[PDB]
Design a protein around this ligand. Structure first.
Ligand SMILES: Nc1nc2c(c(=O)[nH]1)N[C@H]1C(S)=C(S)[C@@H](COP(=O)(O)OP(=O)(O)OC[C@H]3O[C@@H](n4cnc5c(=O)[nH]c(N)nc54)[C@H](O)[C@@H]3O)O[C@H]1N2
Ligand SMILES: Nc1nc2c(c(=O)[nH]1)N[C@H]1C(S)=C(S)[C@@H](COP(=O)(O)OP(=O)(O)OC[C@H]3O[C@@H](n4cnc5c(=O)[nH]c(N)nc54)[C@H](O)[C@@H]3O)O[C@H]1N2
Ligand code: HEC
Ligand code: HEC
Ligand code: SF4
Ligand code: MOS
Lengths: 799, 109
């Protein structure tokens, strides 16, 4: 950071702990305390700026109630599901987890153990956990909070391009002529990327900013064209624009002919509910919901021709004139368009289709993989990309886009992990929604949650999560830095080291992996999630977790532990303690006796190197403020799939979508289909849920910071003033928000930053005293299994 | 032997009474805003903050008139135009839990 020999503070670089923007910060330390952070002037993402959350990073680790000791439910001197929590030692906590996991593995097997992880894990935490479950316990029941977030984007990428994550980058914000926000609230949710859109718009005022949303929020304060549309009608609007492009003869014939093919997907695919729900019994195509057939351009044009202006304007409530203004930006071949979307497209019961359908617009016009012409899916968490998606900490995944169902992918993971053939389970395990259902049903019985607060974050708390966690057939372990409602619903709570109390890596929304050193020591006996996974692996011999016919294939593993197999395997332990930079602590390298993070990262990086996902050498990331993959011959890649920018693209081609075997991207014909639950006479409002600028997620870190808590103390129900008048409400009056599943209590805000149309309310989810996920429905896109938290039906009742 | 002060004493299964909506306090880090901001327009056609805080209320510092290349400009930079991304007002209420943060001045003396 600084060359100086006279600062009394030690300043070091790190990525921000919060959003997927991935601002670089510098962090000042003295006497084991972070006393300040600043935006890093040398970081390209943010060039010295932060938002209010990044400016209060110096306070997030110092809530007075940080967890410092393992806490286990006990009564009469032993573990008891009904006991209250008591302090125990690490050895006692692990002894109990060991007894519980072993009992369950023996009686039920690996489909009855699981983990719920995180896009806030460090890259090496995610990788170590994926190894422990998929190669160690041989369970694919590891899924992350990022299933609630980016799984529709990832499914959309794999279907259109055959490879995950954006092909543009943040340099596109300085080159676009139109920005189209498809429900993203960037002003509050990606504030420094909104600063880059604002600089582009105000400094180059021919630029257009178009914001589409189901309620008015702060992005409308920059919008040239604001569009409020009915929930889920974005599918119809996306087809309207495809139809406009074709109708006005604005298809890029050369690009479409060289570089695309067309498919038509299956429809009537249900809503990812339990199989006995009426919506599932009624659905024709729920059992293979991503199926598609090849069609021609002419069939595609006939398909989208049904989405004409009369039908779309009436369905969406958007005037024809605004539909045409928006479609014209897409169609005009001289306007570079950056399309941006976040949970409005992904937390959507047809979210995978919406992802495909926004790619259609760029593929019809060839506006892709070049500066400013960029369909850019925004990622939420700091490492939903770098950790959950790239490492593959999902129930169907292996690293580097691979899937457990592909026997060549299992063979590659077995080769790199030095496992006997057939170790890796070949069927997808329980994804996030299904994990809560299986906990409720008694089929998932030993469960470990890390770096998330899924009791607060998962939909339908009263019907699935809470009954599942408190089922006496189940033993629930939660690792957290603070008390949370998820830890309160657990049986064993493990105190965890967070952010700069450990060496880390996060990968942001534009493929930038950013490292940090451990800059301070955690309080009390708190230890990293990394240390916990690796230490727990010591408690299991291969005979206890692998079947005999598997061990017979690799008899050298007889008698060894999973710690030996997974972490001390000649690869993960190949960098000695001398490689550790002696200027910083490294608690896990000291505990295990080698450079664990470097060995994990380099073994993990073997999957992507030479296979389109290349990570640079470990040490390069401690030197840089992030590098964007693929890093090839030490050069980062900004635009993927574009000749001259991406070194994997064949000469003479212009573009090559090499994730697909023919090199072509797919354009999909897909329809509008309605939400799982819309308002009716009994529940006449739409409930939309989400976030505000000043709090992160469940608020367990930001609402412990004095300034952030005081900036927005409690959730509220944002309501149209005339809707409040009609219910006999004033601002500040208490209501219940009630659905068919549960209720919560909160006060009405009729003059706040979020101003919904009549019939719709917005409730942010950061307040642990106002559990809005008691009200939401755990319906999902049937393809990505991602929950739609953005619409369901509610009644509002004056208390 | 465990409580979450962000929720308060209420069982997960029940719903507490919501606290009152507290008024805003009129009183390295971006200073917090020691006044209400609810009637203050902040949009691309009008920045009401700049009516009192322009360099022509203490004014915004020179860093607010700098572009991404640190050139100083005649007017507020677009990169700081939306002030409330960084400056927040404060409810007239106490925090829910103590926080052991120590600032630079304190750690240095
Ligand atoms: N301040 C803050 N920033 C964050 C986070 C945080 O907790 N706090 N979390 C990060 C994470 S992990 C995420 S995933 C992002 C989420 O970032 P966003 O998705 O931008 O924000 P939310 O508040 O979750 O979602 C509200 C948006 O959903 C859109 N929407 C609702 N229904 C529909 C619909 O039918 N179609 C479409 N197209 N849009 C719809 C609404 O118009 C509204 O703008 O924020 C990231 N950044
Ligand atoms: N209704 C509704 N629900 C939603 C959303 C929505 O828009 N509406 N958004 C969904 C989405 S997109 C997402 S990403 C999820 C996010 O939901 P979560 O990830 O469940 O929420 P967080 O509060 O980010 O949880 C992170 C936890 O990590 C803890 N902690 C911090 N650092 C560490 C560490 O290093 N180790 C450990 N072990 N713990 C640590 C924190 O105290 C906190 O409890 O929420 C989803 N849920
Ligand atoms: C006059 C009618 C004002 C308008 C409009 C805005 N502010 Fe203000 N502000 C005003 C006064 C008289 C004061 C106290 C004097 C002082 O500068 O402290 C302030 C204070 C602030 C501060 C604190 C600055 C500091 O002392 O370090 C900030 C950060 C602030 N005001 C921001 C701010 C914002 C973002 C505004 C629009 C939403 C805004 N102010 C409008 C007077 C007036
Ligand atoms: C983050 C990217 C910011 C934005 C947007 C705005 N301000 Fe700011 N401000 C910010 C920082 C980190 C600081 C402290 C360091 C400094 O630059 O001085 C400030 C400071 C102020 C002040 C106090 C100035 C002083 O002399 O002490 C004021 C009155 C102020 N800021 C107001 C303000 C206005 C009105 C904004 C929108 C036009 C604005 N700030 C945006 C960080 C950020
Ligand atoms: S924009 Fe995101 S990454 Fe940047 S400081 Fe704010 S929360 Fe952190
Ligand atoms: Mo939200 S990842």
């Amino acid at each position: 950071v600084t060359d100086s020999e006279v600062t009394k503070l030690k300043w070091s670089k790190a990525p921000c702990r919060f959003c997927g923007t991935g601002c670089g910060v510098t962090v000042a330390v003295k006497d084991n305390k972070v006393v300040a952070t600043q935006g890093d002037p040398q970081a390209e993402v943010n060039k010295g700026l932060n938002c209010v959350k990044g400016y209060f990073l110096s306070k997030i680790m110092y809530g007075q109630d940080r967890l410092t000791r393992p806490l286990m439910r006990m009564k009469n001197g032993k573990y008891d599901k009904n006991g209250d929590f008591a302090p125990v030692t690490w050895d006692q906590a692990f002894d109990e987890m060991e007894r519980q996991f072993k009992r369950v593995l023996k009686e039920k097997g690996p489909t009855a153990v699981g983990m719920f992880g995180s896009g806030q894990w460090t890259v090496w935490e995610g990788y170590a956990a994926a190894k422990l479950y998929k190669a160690g316990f041989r369970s694919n029941n590891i899924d992350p909070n990022a299933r609630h977030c980016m799984a529709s984007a990832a499914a959309g990428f794999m279907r259109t391009f055959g490879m995950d994550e954006p092909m543009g980058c943040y340099d596109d914000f300085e080159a676009a002529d139109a920005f189209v926000l498809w429900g993203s609230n960037m002003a509050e949710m990606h504030p420094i990327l909104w600063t880059r859109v604002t600089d582009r718009r105000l400094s180059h005022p021919k630029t257009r900013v178009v914001v589409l949303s189901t309620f008015t929020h702060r992005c409308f304060d920059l919008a040239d064209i604001g569009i409020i549309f009915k929930p889920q009608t974005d599918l119809a609007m996306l087809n309207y624009i495809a139809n406009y492009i074709i109708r006005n003869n604005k298809v890029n014939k050369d690009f479409v002919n060289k570089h695309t093919v067309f498919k038509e997907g299956v429809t009537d695919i249900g809503y990812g509910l339990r199989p006995d729900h009426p919506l599932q019994k009624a659905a024709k195509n729920a059992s293979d919901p991503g199926a598609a057939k090849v069609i021609t351009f002419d069939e595609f044009a006939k398909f989208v021709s049904k989405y004409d202006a009369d039908y779309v304007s009436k369905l969406s409530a958007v005037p024809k004139a605004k539909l045409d203004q928006l479609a014209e930006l897409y169609a005009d071949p001289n306007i570079k368009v950056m399309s941006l979307w976040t949970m409005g497209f992904n937390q959507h019961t047809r979210g995978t289709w919406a992802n495909n359908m926004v790619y259609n617009l760029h593929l019809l016009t060839g506006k892709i993989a070049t500066p400013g012409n960029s369909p850019f899916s925004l990622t939420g968490q700091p490492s939903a990309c770098g950790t959950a998606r790239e490492v593959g900490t999902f129930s169907h995944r292996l690293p580097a886009d691979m899937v457990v169902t592909n026997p060549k992918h299992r063979e590659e993971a077995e080769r790199i992990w030095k496992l006997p053939p057939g170790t890796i389970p070949d069927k997808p395990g329980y994804d996030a929604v299904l994990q809560n259902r299986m906990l409720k049903d008694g089929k998932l019985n030993a469960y470990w949650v890390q770096v998330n607060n899924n009791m607060q974050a998962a939909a339908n708390l009263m019907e699935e999560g809470l009954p599942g966690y408190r089922n006496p057939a189940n033993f629930i372990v939660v690792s957290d830095a603070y008390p949370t409602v998820t830890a309160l619903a657990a049986d064993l709570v493990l105190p965890s080291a967070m952010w700069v109390e450990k060496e880390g890596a996060y990968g942001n929304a534009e493929r930038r992996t950013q490292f940090w050193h451990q800059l301070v020591d955690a309080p009390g006996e708190a230890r990293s999630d990394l240390w916990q996974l690796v230490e727990f692996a010591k408690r299991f011999k291969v005979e206890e977790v692998w079947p005999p016919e598997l061990i017979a294939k690799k008899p050298e593993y007889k008698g060894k532990t999973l710690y030996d197999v997974l972490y001390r395997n000649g690869q993960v332990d190949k960098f000695p303690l001398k490689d550790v930079n002696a200027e910083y602590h490294n608690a896990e390298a000291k505990a295990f006796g080698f450079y664990l993070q470097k060995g994990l990262f380099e073994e993990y990086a073997t999957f992507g190197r030479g296979h389109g996902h290349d990570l640079a050498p470990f040490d390069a990331y401690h030197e840089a403020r992030g590098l964007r993959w693929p890093v090839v011959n030490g050069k980062e890649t900004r635009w993927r799939y574009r000749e001259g920018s991406d070194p994997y693209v064949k000469a003479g081609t212009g573009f090559q979508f090499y994730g697909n075997p023919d090199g072509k991207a797919v354009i999909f014909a897909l329809p509008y289909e309605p939400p799982a639950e819309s308002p009716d006479k009994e529940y006449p409002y739409w409930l939309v849920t989400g976030r505000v600028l000043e709090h992160w997620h469940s608020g367990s870190m930001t609402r412990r910071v004095p300034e952030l808590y005081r900036s927005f103390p409690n959730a509220v129900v944002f309501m149209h003033p005339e809707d409040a008048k009609a219910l006999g409400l004033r601002r500040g009056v208490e209501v219940e928000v009630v659905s068919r599943r549960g209720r919560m209590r909160s006060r009405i805000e009729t003059r706040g930053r979020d101003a919904p149309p009549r019939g719709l309310v917005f409730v942010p989810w950061f307040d642990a005293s106002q559990l809005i996920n008691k009200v939401t429905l755990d319906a999902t896109c049937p393809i990505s299994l991602q929950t739609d938290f953005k619409k369901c039906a509610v009644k509002i009742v004056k208390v | 032997g465990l409580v979450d002060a962000m929720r308060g004493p209420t069982a997960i299964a029940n719903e507490p009474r919501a606290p009152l909506l507290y008024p805003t306090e009129n009183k390295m880090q971006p200073p917090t805003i020691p006044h209400k901001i609810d009637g203050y327009q902040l949009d691309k056609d009008f920045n009401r903050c700049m009516f009192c805080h322009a360099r022509t209320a203490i004014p915004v510092s020179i860093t607010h008139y700098m572009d991404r290349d640190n050139n100083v400009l005649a007017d507020v930079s677009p990169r700081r135009y939306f002030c409330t991304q960084c400056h927040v007002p404060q409810a007239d209420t106490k925090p829910l839990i103590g926080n052991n943060f120590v600032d630079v001045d304190t750690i240095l003396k």
